[PDB]
């Protein structure tokens, strides 16, 4: 559940960095080279399903990248807004009243 | 034609100033085949519009540190040239 995942992850910067690191590691874990990994007399035809599923795992990684991109856009907008409010306060009515 | 637009990377300035700077830089780059001549035309337009004189940065490699006064300061990339045009006074 994407909403549950986002709610669990939250808006902590350490949480965002951890999500990025874990997603990158998982995406790297899907190096699809051998398709028909047939273990036994009956050839387990996991090839095309696994290739498309790896494409889907990378698609979920890109979706998580987009969701974290929106979350980091909100976080960077908030941080820049707070810093710019402080800078505007210093420029208009500085601390030396 | 390269689009010298701006992304929201750092934007604390006047919108009219940013639009005038972007249009002048892109128009001068299109008009003058020399980069130095394009920079000269951009400086001439900027000194004609927002009084003379001030120098801006439009190039491949850009970066510095100064007390950027508001309403005329930004740090972005205007297409193929980094958009860092800040007027101090």
């Amino acid at each position: 559940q994407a909403e549950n995942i986002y709610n669990r992850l939250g808006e902590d910067l350490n949480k965002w960095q951890a999500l990025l690191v874990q997603i990158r590691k998982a995406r790297g874990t899907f190096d699809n080279a051998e398709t028909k990994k047939e273990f036994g007399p009956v050839v387990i035809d996991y090839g095309k399903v696994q290739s498309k599923v790896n494409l889907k795992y990378d698609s979920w990684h890109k979706e998580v990248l987009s969701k974290f991109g929106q979350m980091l856009g909100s976080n960077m907008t908030e941080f820049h807004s707070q810093i710019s409010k402080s800078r505007q306060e210093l420029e208009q009515h500085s601390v030396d009243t | 034609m390269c689009d010298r637009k701006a992304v929201i990377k750092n934007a604390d300035m006047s919108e009219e100033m940013q639009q005038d700077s972007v249009e002048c830089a892109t128009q001068a780059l299109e008009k003058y085949n020399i980069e130095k001549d394009i920079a000269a035309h951009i400086k001439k337009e900027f000194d004609k519009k927002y009084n003379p004189t001030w120098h801006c940065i439009v190039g491949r490699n850009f970066g510095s540190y100064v007390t950027h006064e508001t309403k005329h300061f930004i740090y972005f990339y205007l297409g193929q040239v980094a958009i860092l045009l800040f007027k101090s006074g």
Binding site: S94 | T67, F73, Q80, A82
Partner: peptide
Amino acid sequence: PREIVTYTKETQTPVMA
């Protein structure tokens, strides 16, 4: 008089690469 508003909009400005 004239005051100094050092509200610098520092950013990451990379070279072409």
